[PDB]
Amino acid sequence: SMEQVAMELRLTELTRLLRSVLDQLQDKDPARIFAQPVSLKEVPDYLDHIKHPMDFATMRKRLEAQGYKNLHEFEEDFDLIIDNCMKYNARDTVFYRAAVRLRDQGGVVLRQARREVDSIG
Fold first, then answer.
1. Based on C-alpha coordinates, what's the Rg of the chain?
2. What is the Cα–Cα distance from 69 to 120, expressed in whole angstroms?
3. Domain count, the chain
4. Whole domain around residue 93: which residue ranges?
5. Distance CA 6, CA 3 (A)
6. CATH number at residue 97
7. Where is this cross-link: Glycyl lysine isopeptide (Lys-Gly) (interchain with G-Cter in SUMO2)?
């Protein structure tokens, strides 16, 4: 149907906008602390601590399959990156501090992304 096509075009345009959002958030992580999944070879206990691991590469896979239907879903995954790190790592660590700075800087970007998603529809 044409209605199904139109819905698919909207998902594609959302995907474009989320791709640009993802780029902008990841630039706020120049250390690349959040680029890849925590390795279970190097942190064998991780899944005892963290139930839903997340990272920028995993988000990019989901994005490229058009797997985010709305901005809320994408924000949920970004918050997991931050929140997981702030739980596993102590306040005094470079990892925790990196997550705080990512959260603070990413807020700016997400605030305008929400406006854009509502504005364009």
1. 16
2. 15
3. 1
4. 1-121
5. 5
6. 1.20.920.10
7. 41
108: nearest Cα among 31, 34, 21, 14: 21
Which three-class secondary structure state does DSSP give residue 39?
Answer: coil
Tokens of 3: 């209605």
Distance CA 97, CA 36 (A): 18
Q: Cβ-count burial of 59 within 10 angstroms (0-12 exposed, 13-18 middle, 19+ buried)?
A: buried
* C-alpha distances in Å from residue 7, one per residue of 2, 88, 117: 9, 39, 15
Q: Which of 56, 50, 107, 114 is nearest to 83 (CA)?
A: 50
DSSP state at residue 37: P
Amino acid at 104: D
